[PDB]
Design an enzyme around this catalytic site. Structure first.
Site, PDB file in Angstrom:
ATOM      1  N   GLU B  63       0.773  -1.238   0.000  1.00  0.00           N
ATOM      2  CA  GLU B  63       0.000   0.000   0.000  1.00  0.00           C
ATOM      3  C   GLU B  63       0.810   1.296   0.000  1.00  0.00           C
ATOM      4  OE1 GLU B  63      -3.527  -0.626   2.586  1.00  0.00           O
ATOM      5  OE2 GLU B  63      -4.129   1.186   1.464  1.00  0.00           O
ATOM      6  N   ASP B  78       0.038  -6.315   1.784  1.00  0.00           N
ATOM      7  CA  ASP B  78      -0.897  -5.335   2.292  1.00  0.00           C
ATOM      8  C   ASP B  78      -0.662  -5.457   3.806  1.00  0.00           C
ATOM      9  OD1 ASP B  78      -4.476  -4.735   1.850  1.00  0.00           O
ATOM     10  OD2 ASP B  78      -2.869  -3.630   2.851  1.00  0.00           O
ATOM     11  N   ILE B  80      -1.529  -4.047   6.349  1.00  0.00           N
ATOM     12  CA  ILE B  80      -2.706  -4.031   7.202  1.00  0.00           C
ATOM     13  C   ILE B  80      -3.947  -3.834   6.358  1.00  0.00           C
ATOM     14  CG2 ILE B  80      -3.993  -2.769   8.999  1.00  0.00           C
ATOM     15  CD1 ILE B  80      -1.445  -2.121  10.350  1.00  0.00           C
ATOM     16  N   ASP B  81      -4.757  -4.876   6.165  1.00  0.00           N
ATOM     17  CA  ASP B  81      -5.995  -4.775   5.386  1.00  0.00           C
ATOM     18  C   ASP B  81      -7.135  -4.500   6.359  1.00  0.00           C
ATOM     19  OD1 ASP B  81      -8.410  -6.966   3.985  1.00  0.00           O
ATOM     20  OD2 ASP B  81      -7.774  -5.090   3.065  1.00  0.00           O
ATOM     21  N   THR B  83      -7.699  -0.778   7.639  1.00  0.00           N
ATOM     22  CA  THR B  83      -7.245   0.289   8.525  1.00  0.00           C
ATOM     23  C   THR B  83      -8.397   1.091   9.109  1.00  0.00           C
ATOM     24  OG1 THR B  83      -6.419   1.227   6.420  1.00  0.00           O
ATOM     25  CG2 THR B  83      -4.787   0.907   8.177  1.00  0.00           C
ATOM     26  N   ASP B 208      -4.489  -6.950  -2.508  1.00  0.00           N
ATOM     27  CA  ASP B 208      -5.568  -7.490  -1.701  1.00  0.00           C
ATOM     28  C   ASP B 208      -5.850  -8.916  -2.105  1.00  0.00           C
ATOM     29  OD1 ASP B 208      -6.275  -5.181  -0.157  1.00  0.00           O
ATOM     30  OD2 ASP B 208      -7.185  -4.327  -1.976  1.00  0.00           O
TER      31      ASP B 208
END
Ligand code: CA
Ligand code: CA
Ligand code: CA
Ligand code: CA
Lengths: 259, 259
Positions: B63, B78, B80-81, B83, B208
């Site tokens: 990201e 990713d 942290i999917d 946020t 993703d």
């Protein structure tokens, strides 16, 4: 109606949450669909009879066994909130049993079978989850709001146009997001903890918001009617947010549709 | 590109999932919003440097640090999917790191910080979650389908009309329900396990569906383009369901909108 009723409600909500967690170790399109109902019937019985066993004079209400609550100490339950998720082995199904006296909510315990989270809350003693004090978000501007809500069963072209048009209005403002986990109880519970700022639903039922409410309130949040001011339990709609402001806010931005 | 890369991807996904689980013990409207990004930056660094430390020749994508994948063994991540959920302390945020070689997906590990569920899957060896063999639903009739999907960030009057009109079409058929948990990764993961039958999204990103896909496939499901046939990773849309039929089905019942 005090604690012997609470210690029970939780004890049964725990068993009634285990017998159901072990159920999801299933193996099928429709066979499961039955396992569920069989479970739902197994839970409801468990709770509305062990509680009947003790306090043989209290009234009851649940998805199986109209929602007419007298001033008697009545026990409002939803043996299994989220039967559709359960059918798919979706990790979000709850068992909620709420208790009202003098025709007003005294307490309520909502359980999370899979995540083993236990939401409780009495009136005049705040709300908790696995013994951890819960407190409502405390937000007020929809622009920084995470709204929660679920689709109803009424698959009628009338209905849907409103549901969608309604989502849109909240999205049209700058509400961070909308979530449809597929469970009214847990949604209200999330709001109560602070993981959510608002919630809304038409086509909802009395046994859904009976326990949550107590919790959401002793947590700090507020639960009212899609219109405003008061909250009509025997109705089938609700509007509970992070603050008294937010609530009114999600209102003057919402159109009605029910029954 | 084999296992030393996998054992790492999982080891880092585990740490990168803990350091983030401990983060959610936060206490605030915007202070948290930063804590998150700080975390997101802390995770991404962790992973794209420890993995850089070993195999100093592999490529990366995430990201923060366009999505242009060469035939080099590239690592699609990713950090942290979810946020937005994280900002609210919503128990559904994941850290996904996928690995492709020869310009095609070889494996991918998606983690569930809160529920401690660990989804993995290599190609030619199936998918697992906390060492338990996963297998796709196996459904085919939308009338018995639980669809998953998320809203995008694009808050533009153009967009929204389509998103909603699109939900409607799936609801118009007799699809049991629609869920918007607020996480693409976990959604795809649910599908992979069987807790969901289908998924769809426009405005999605390569990082993703990079790991999920491998998993969804070795699980049995199928992942294709909103149109049909092929799946364009550098595009920003996806369509993965429980069966090759279901997939085509959710297609000839869906309108396009992206970038
Ligand atoms: Ca129920
Ligand atoms: Ca219910
Ligand atoms: Ca992310
Ligand atoms: Ca993402």
């Amino acid at each position: 109606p005090w604690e012997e009723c609470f210690q029970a409600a939780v004890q049964l909500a725990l068993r009634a949450g285990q017998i159901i967690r072990k159920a999801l170790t299933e193996e099928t399109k429709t066979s499961a669909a039955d396992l569920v109902t069989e479970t739902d019937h197994l839970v409801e019985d468990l709770i509305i009879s062990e509680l009947r066993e003790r306090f043989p004079s209290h009234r009851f209400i649940a998805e199986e066994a109209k929602c007419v609550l007298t001033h008697s100490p009545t026990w409002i339950i939803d043996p299994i909130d989220g039967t559709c998720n359960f059918v798919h082995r979706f990790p979000t199904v709850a068992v909620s049993i709420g208790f009202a006296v003098r025709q007003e909510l005294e307490f309520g315990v909502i359980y999370h079978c899979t995540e083993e989270r236990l939401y409780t809350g009495r009136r005049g003693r705040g709300a908790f989850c696995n013994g951890q004090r819960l407190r409502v978000s405390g937000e007020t501007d929809l622009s920084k709001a995470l709204v929660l809500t679920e689709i109803g069963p009424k698959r009628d072209p009338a209905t849907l146009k409103l549901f969608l048009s309604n989502m849109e209005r909240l999205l049209h403002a700058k509400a961070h997001g909308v979530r449809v986990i597929g469970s009214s109880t847990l949604a209200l519970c999330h709001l109560a903890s602070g993981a959510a700022d608002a919630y809304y639903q038409f086509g909802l039922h009395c046994w859904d918001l009976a326990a949550a409410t107590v919790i959401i309130r002793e947590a700090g949040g507020i639960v009212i009617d899609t219109s405003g001011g008061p909250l009509d339990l025997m109705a089938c709609r609700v509007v509970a947010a992070s603050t008294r402001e937010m609530a009114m806010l999600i209102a003057q931005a919402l159109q009605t549709i029910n029954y």
